[PDB]
Amino acid sequence: GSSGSSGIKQHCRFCKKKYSDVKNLIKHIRDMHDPQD
Ligand SMILES: [Zn+2]
Numbered sequence: 001g002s003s004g005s006s007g008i009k010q011h012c013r014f015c016k017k018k019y020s021d022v023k024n025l026i027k028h029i030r031d032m033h034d035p036q037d
Contacts, residue, residue, distance in 0.1 A: 009021075011025075012025060014032070015033070
């Protein structure tokens with residue numbers, strides 16, 4: 001196909017886990033790591 005929703009999946013920079021979108025990754029970061037400083 002000439003176009004599609006490819007490459008949208010994301011990874012945690014702290015614990016190297018994976019998510020199919022950025023918003024569930026941001027919730028994971030705020031719940032498990034919280035890089036506030
Ligand atoms: Zn993580």
